[PDB]
Amino acid sequence: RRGDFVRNWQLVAAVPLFQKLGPAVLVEIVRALRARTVPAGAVICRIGEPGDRMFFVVEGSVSVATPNPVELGPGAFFGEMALISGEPRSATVSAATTVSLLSLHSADFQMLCSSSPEIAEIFRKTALERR
């Protein structure tokens, strides 16, 4: 899908994390990432459910329903904890505003992790801080 591919470049530009990727790995993730828009209030992922993908916020913000809610703005990522640990979602995440998201399925996530050990590390430490 070509339309999806060329649109992904401007969306990927919104996520500073990918500034750490060379051209080849950028193409891989720009191929792998799916763009979606989530209306305000809508559940993106639900506590206790299985997680097969992780998300990057392009525009808007999400709300992690931890006892003290966590707002995540553009460039932020979530959903990595279930991918790393294999456990169900630890928290519900909803669109706080209408949200533009990029999602990464599990296989592509592991491919990004081997393709970039620096980014693997960031997901790793971030998931540790969050749990």
Ligand X SMILES: Nc1nc2c(ncn2[C@@H]2O[C@@H]3COP(=O)(O)O[C@H]3[C@H]2O)c(=O)[nH]1
Q: Output the known binding site.
A: 79-80, 89-90, 130
Q: Which does 4 bind (CB under 5 to 8 A by kind): K ion, its own copies, Cl ion, none?
A: none
The residues that touch its own copies, with contacts defined as CB under 8 A, are 13-14, 16, 39-43, 46, 57, 59, 61, 63, 65, 67-78, 92-94, 96, 98, 126, 129-130
What is residue 86's three-state secondary structure? coil
Residue 32, judged by CB atoms within 10 A of its CB (0-12, 13-18, 19+), counts as middle
Q: Is 17 exposed, middle or buried (0-12, 13-18, 19+ CB in 10 A)?
A: middle
CB of residue 104 vs its own copies: minimum separation in angstroms? 15
Looking at 47, 70, 111, 120, which residue binds K ion (CB under 5 A)?
47
CA 45 to the chain's CA centroid? 11
Binding status of residue 105 toward K ion by CB under 5 A: yes
98 near K ion, rule: CB under 5 A = no
Q: Given the complex with Cl ion, which of 3 and 129 has the nearer CB atom?
A: 129
**Where is 57: in which H helix or E strand?**
strand 53-59
